[PDB]
Amino acid sequence: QTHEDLYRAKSEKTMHVVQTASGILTFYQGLEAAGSMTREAAQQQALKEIKGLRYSQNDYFWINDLRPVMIMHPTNPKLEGQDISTIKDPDGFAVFNEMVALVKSKGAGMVNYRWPKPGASEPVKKTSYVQLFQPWGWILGSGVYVD
């Protein structure tokens, strides 16, 4: 039983909630591909639904693109529609740029950074799984705060 095994286990949870939530993207992208909704309407519906999802103690999902611009953020909604390339956490970690570089290399993975908790302002350590949804150029993310 390795260190690698312990970390693989804890983060599988995060991976699996993101995979679950990404089925909404899948569903709506299918409606686009079939011609039943426009892309932008499929997008907006998918975001609306993912915005309300929660698990555990108020853990949530966000979506940013590869530019990176924030597409949907349920707890920091004033980031929506903004270029988030210049955001850095207190350790100097370039949160969204790193997420983009990660998914461009591997598709998905784990990243650690500091971020406020919902309705708070103090950046707290967080470990997130991010996953590229390729047809729309969207990164879907969720993570868990160290406490």
Numbering used by the authors: 32 to 178
Question: What do the paper's sentences say?
Answer:
Chemoreceptor proteins bind ligands (either directly or indirectly) and transmit a signal to downstream chemotaxis machinery in order to control flagellar rotation and bacterial motility. However, a recent bioinformatics study has shown that the most common extracellular sensor domains found in prokaryotes are actually Cache (Calcium channels and chemotaxis receptors) domains. Our results demonstrate that this chemoreceptor, designated PscD, has a single Cache sensor domain that recognises specific C2 and C3 carboxylate ligands.
The Cache domain of PscD consists of an N-terminal helix-loop-helix, followed by an antiparallel five strand β-sheet, which is surrounded by additional helices on either side. The carboxyl oxygen atoms of propionate form hydrogen bonds with four residues: Tyr90, His103, Tyr143 and Lys156 and the ligand is sandwiched between two tryptophan residues, Trp92 and Trp145, giving the impression of being ‘flat-packed’ with distances of 3.5 to 4.2 Å. Overall, the bulky hydrophobic residues that line the binding pocket appear to prevent the binding of larger (C4 and larger) carboxylates.
